[PDB]
Design a protein around this ligand. Structure first.
Ligand code: HEM
Ligand code: HEM
Ligand SMILES: O=C(NCCCc1cccnc1)[C@@H](Cc1ccccc1)SC[C@H](Cc1ccccc1)NC(=O)C(F)(F)F
Ligand SMILES: O=C(NCCCc1cccnc1)[C@@H](Cc1ccccc1)SC[C@H](Cc1ccccc1)NC(=O)C(F)(F)F
Lengths: 426, 426
C-alpha cells in the first residue's frame, strides 16, 4: 500500500513502514505542507499511517474537487472515530445522510435568520465591554480568548436555543488513530469516544433539558439533534474566540491598522452607535482586517475529501480511496500568489486588489456544497464583537506578549502562549 | 444496535449482548432458518454479532432485491475478511470494481466457450471410469467425493488453463469473526488471511508459473488475475464434487430413479456413446435428478446482499447497512410450496410440474446480475460426469453408508460422514 504514489508517478517524501510519513508532523501540519509544497510543486503525496493522501494545489483541480465533482466523487471527508452517536453529526456524516442534514440545517443561517440575531447578540457585547472595563481600570495584561470565549459562548447558547448567561468541554492519543485506523472499529464497540463520555453525557440530557428550526422540521431524529447541537456549540465557541484572538494580536502589533479601523467604526457608527446588520456589511476595512487575519490563520489549515471512486480530474488519475487534501495554510502563504506573504497587510483585500485573488487559493471557509455552513454567522458574530470592543478600547502589546507569535505544532491553528495584551479605555 | 428490529416491528429471536443470536447456530444455519421461518413467518430478523440481518421469504420481495434493485441498493454481499489480495476476487469485490470484473469474466461461460470444453472434458471422464473400474473389481465400499474431486480437479485445471493431470487446499476461527468484525481491519494489516498464506503463496507464483480470456482482455491487472483463478479453482473443485456426492447418494437410496436414469442415458447414447454438448441438454430426466438434488442440498444455503442505502421495498422499509438474507435451504423445504418436502422426488421438475415452481423460491444458483457466474458450466460438467459413470456402473448402499444422511452443522452443506457406496460394473 506504500507504493501507490511511486506507481502513479506522483512525487513525495519516502514513507517509513507503518508510520507512513507521520514523523514529519513534528513541526506541525503547516510547516510540513509548506515544505512539501516547495519540495515537489503542484501535486505531491504522502501516507498518514497506511492512508494515502494526495495534496493538490491547482485552482482548477481544487475547484473540480470541492465544487464540480462533490456530489459524485468527493462527498465526504476523512473518516473520524471513535465517534459513537456523533457519527450522525453533519461535519461527520456521509453521503445521503449528510445531504439530508445539510438541507435541514441550511435555513438556519439565512440572511433573515441572522438579521433576527443582531438585536439578541447586541446584549453580551455590552457584557463583553463591561467585563473588559473591569480588567482595564486595572493596568494589567489581559487574556483575550478567555473574555472572547466567554462572550462567544454567551452568543452560541442564545442564538441557537437562547439563554441569558453571564460567562464569568475542552498528538496525544490521536497519534495512535492514524497508525491504527483498524483500531477505530474496535473502540466504537467499547463506547470509547474521542469526546470524553462525561462531556457528552453532560449534554445527552442537557439538550433534552437553531433548536427551534430542528423539531419544526421534524425527517429528523432526537439523539441526532443533540449531536448537531454539540457541533454548533463547539464551532461557535472555539472558532470565534480563536480568530478574535488572532485579530486583536495583529491589530496590536500593527497599530496603524487599528486606528484606521477605529476611524471607520466611528464614521459608520458615530457617538458609539449600536452596530446593526446593515452597518456591519458597510465597514469594508473591518472586512479587510478579518479576511487578512484569516489568510494568515485559517484555523482549519486543510480541506479534505475522500475519493469514493476512480476518476481522472484535470488530466490526473486519482484511484479509489485516496484522501484528497488542499493545504490551505500552505496556499495562503505561497509567494507565487502573495507578495511578502508573512506580512500582515489588509490592503490585499481592498476593492482595488480583491480581484487579483483566486477564491480557490484563499479558502478560509472551504468551497462547494460542503463549505462552512456557518460562514455568514461567524463573520457577523465576529464583526459585531470587533465593532463594540474597538469602539471603547485600544490594544497595546505587553512585556509578556509573544512577538513574533509562534503557532502551535498541534492539530489546531492555536498560539503556543495565549494571546495577552494591554487594554486602554478611550 | 440490538433494538433495530424491535423498532421496525420485525419479529425475531431475542439476541444476547455481543453474541447477537450466534448461539442459535449450534444446529447449523439450515435448522436455524427453518425454525425461524416457522417461528415468525414471511419476514424476521436477527443479529450476527452486532450485524443486523433481515431474512425475507417473499418471492416478489426476493425478486426485488436480487434482480430489480441490484445495481442500485443491493450490489454487494456481506463483507468478508481478512482477505488480503483476495479482496479483488469477483465473489468478494464490490460496486464498480465488481461490475468491471463481472463483465470481463462473463464471456468465459458462453454457449460456445462451453461447447469447446466438451471434447476436452471428455478425457478425464475416462480417467474417472478407469479410476472407478479399479476399486469396483475390488468388492469394497467407495468414497465418492475423492474420485469425484480428483475428476473435478482434472476438469477445472484444464478448462481454464489446460493441464493433462491424473489426480491420483482444503465454526473454528470464523466464530470470532462475527462477534469481532471490528477485528477484521486488524488482521488485514497483519497479512493474516482466512486462506492460509502457504496455500495462496503456492499460487501467487503458480499462476505466474479462462486464463487465455484474461490477458487477452488486458483493464485487468495481474495479482487480481491470480485471485480470480483461486475463486474458479475452488468453485469448480468443491461444488462439483460435493453435489455429485449428493446425487450418487440419492440414486443409491432411490434405486428406481437410478435405473430410469440409466435407461434414458442408453437411449440418447446407445452403445455407450460419448456424451456431446447437444445430447446432454436433451436428457430431461438427468436434468430432473440434478435439479431435485440441488433442491435438497443447495450448497450455498443462503443468498445475501448488503443494503447500501435506505429503501422501502414492497411496502417494507429497510434501513441502510442491513444484510438482506434469503434462506435458500429453508425455502427449498417449505411445505407451503413443496408436497412432502423431505422426500427425494425428481418428478417435481418434469415438464408437467416444472411450472408450479417459483424461480424465486427455488434458487440454487442465485438470481439477478450477481447469480452464479458458472451455473451453465457446473450443470454441464456434472452431467457429463453422471452420463459417463452411470453408463458403466450401478451404485448400491453399503453397511457403512449413512442412512438417513445427516447434514453437517458447519457453514457448508457437507455430509457428516463422507458418502460411501458400493459400485458394480454393468
Ligand atoms: C472564523 C470562523 C470559522 C471558520 C474559519 C470556519 C471554517 C470552516 C471550514 C474551512 C470548514 C470545512 C469546509 C470544507 O471542508 O470544504 C468548515 C466546516 C463546517 N463549519 Fe465552520 N468555520 C467557522 C465557524 C463556524 C461556525 C460559527 C459554525 C456554526 C455552526 C460552523 C459550522 C461548520 C460546520 C457544521 C461545518 C461542516 C460542514 C459540513 O460537513 O457540511 N463553522 N468550517
Ligand atoms: C453445483 C454447482 C454450483 C452451485 C449450486 C453454485 C451456486 C452459487 C450461488 C448460489 C451463488 C450466489 C448467487 C447469489 O449470491 O445470488 C454463486 C456465486 C458464484 N459462483 Fe457458483 N455455484 C456452483 C458452481 C460454480 C462454478 C463451477 C463456478 C466456476 C467459476 C462458480 C463461480 C461462482 C462465482 C464467481 C460466484 C460469485 C458471483 C459474483 O460475485 O458475481 N460456481 N454460486
Ligand atoms: O466536528 C469536527 N470539526 C468541525 C466542527 C466545528 C468547526 C470547527 C472549525 C471550523 N468549522 C466548524 C471534528 C471534531 C469535533 C470537535 C468538537 C465537537 C464535535 C466534533 S470531526 C470531523 C473533522 C472535519 C472538520 C475539521 C475542521 C473544520 C471543519 C470540519 N475531521 C478532522 O478533524 C480530521 F481529523 F480528519 F482532521
Ligand atoms: O469466495 C467465496 N465463495 C464463492 C467461491 C466459489 C463458489 C462456491 C459455491 C458456489 N459458487 C461459487 C468465499 C471464500 C473462498 C473460498 C474458496 C476460495 C476463495 C474464497 S468469500 C465470499 C462469500 C460469498 C459466496 C459464498 C458461497 C457461494 C457464493 C458466494 N461469503 C461468505 O461465505 C460468507 F461468510 F459471508 F457467508
Amino acid at each position: 500500500s506504500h507504493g501507490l504514489f511511486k506507481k502513479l508517478g506522483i512525487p513525495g517524501p519516502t514513507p517509513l513502514p507503518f508510520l507512513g510519513n507521520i514523523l514529519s508532523y513534528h513541526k506541525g501540519f503547516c510547516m510540513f505542507d509548506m515544505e512539501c509544497h516547495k519540495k515537489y510543486g503542484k501535486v505531491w503525496g504522502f501516507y498518514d499511517g497506511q492512508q494515502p493522501v494526495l495534496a493538490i494545489t491547482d485552482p482548477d483541480m481544487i475547484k473540480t474537487v470541492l465544487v464540480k465533482e462533490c456530489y459524485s466523487v468527493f462527498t465526504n471527508r476523512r473518516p473520524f472515530g471513535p465517534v459513537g452517536f456523533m457519527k450522525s453529526a453533519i461535519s461527520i456524516a456521509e453521503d445521503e445522510e449528510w445531504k439530508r442534514l445539510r438541507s435541514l440545517l441550511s435555513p438556519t443561517f439565512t440572511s433573515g435568520k441572522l438579521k433576527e440575531m443582531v438585536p439578541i447578540i447586541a446584549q453580551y457585547g455590552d457584557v463583553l465591554v463591561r467585563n473588559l472595563r473591569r480588567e482595564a481600570e486595572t493596568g494589567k495584561p489581559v487574556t483575550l480568548k478567555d473574555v472572547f470565549g466567554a462572550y462567544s459562548m454567551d452568543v452560541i447558547t442564545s442564538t441557537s436555543f437562547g439563554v441569558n448567561i453571564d460567562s464569568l468541554p475542552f498528538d496525544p492519543f490521536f497519534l495512535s488513530i492514524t497508525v491504527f485506523p483498524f483500531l477505530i472499529p474496535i473502540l466504537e464497540v467499547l463506547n470509547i469516544c474521542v469526546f470524553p463520555r462525561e462531556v457528552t453525557n453532560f449534554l445527552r440530557k442537557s439538550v433534552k433539558r437553531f433548536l427551534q428550526l430542528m423539531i419544526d422540521s421534524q425527517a429528523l431524529s432526537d439523539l441526532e439533534l443533540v449531536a448537531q447541537s454539540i457541533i454548533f456549540i463547539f464551532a461557535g465557541y472555539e472558532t470565534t474566540s480563536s480568530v478574535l484572538s488572532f485579530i486583536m494580536y495583529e491589530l496590536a502589533t500593527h497599530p496603524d491598522v487599528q486606528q484606521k479601523l477605529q476611524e471607520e467604526i466611528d464614521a459608520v457608527l458615530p457617538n458609539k452607535a449600536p452596530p446593526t446588520y446593515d452597518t456591519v456589511l458597510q465597514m469594508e476595512y473591518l472586512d479587510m482586517v478579518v479576511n487578512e487575519t484569516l489568510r494568515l490563520f485559517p484555523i482549519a489549515m486543510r480541506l479534505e475529501r475522500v475519493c469514493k471512486k476512480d476518476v481522472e480530474i484535470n488530466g490526473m488519475f486519482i484511484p479509489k480511496g485516496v484522501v484528497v487534501m488542499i493545504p490551505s495554510y500552505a496556499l495562503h502563504r505561497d509567494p507565487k500568489y502573495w507578495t511578502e506573504p508573512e506580512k500582515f497587510l489588509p490592503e490585499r483585500f481592498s476593492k482595488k486588489n480583491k480581484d487579483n485573488i483566486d477564491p480557490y487559493i484563499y479558502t478560509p471557509f472551504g468551497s462547494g456544497p460542503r463549505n462552512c455552513i456557518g460562514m455568514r454567522f461567524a463573520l457577523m458574530n465576529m464583526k459585531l464583537a470587533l465593532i463594540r470592543v474597538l469602539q471603547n478600547f485600544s490594544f497595546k502589546p505587553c512585556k509578556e506578549t509573544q512577538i513574533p507569535l509562534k503557532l502551535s505544532l498541534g492539530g489546531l491553528l492555536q498560539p503556543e502562549k495565549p494571546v495577552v495584551l494591554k487594554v486602554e479605555s478611550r
